[PDB]
Amino acid sequence: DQNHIEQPFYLMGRDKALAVEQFISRFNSGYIKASQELVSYTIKLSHDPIEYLLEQIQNLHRVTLAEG
């Protein structure tokens, strides 16, 4: 087939770190079609900073009394 005996197994050994740059280089432009989907995944996670900010200041003043 080729002047060489080929070596599809010799790479899998040194392709490790190389296989990580492939999954990221292929998702690159993909990160542009998911940007919108990324906003829908955060709406249900860490999306209540305004309601948590007032609760963090109202609890710090009540926790300083320690009455439990």
CATH code reported for the domain at 1-68:
6.10.250.480
Vertex 14 angle, CA 10 and 17, to 5°: 150
3 state DSSP class of 54: helix
Measure the CA angle with vertex 41, ends 40 and 42; round to 5°.
95
H/E run at residue 9: helix 8-14
For 46, phi and psi rounded to 5 degrees? 60, 40
d(C-alpha 68, C-alpha 57), whole Å: 19
Break the chain into its structural domains and give their ranges. 1-68
DSSP state of 15: -
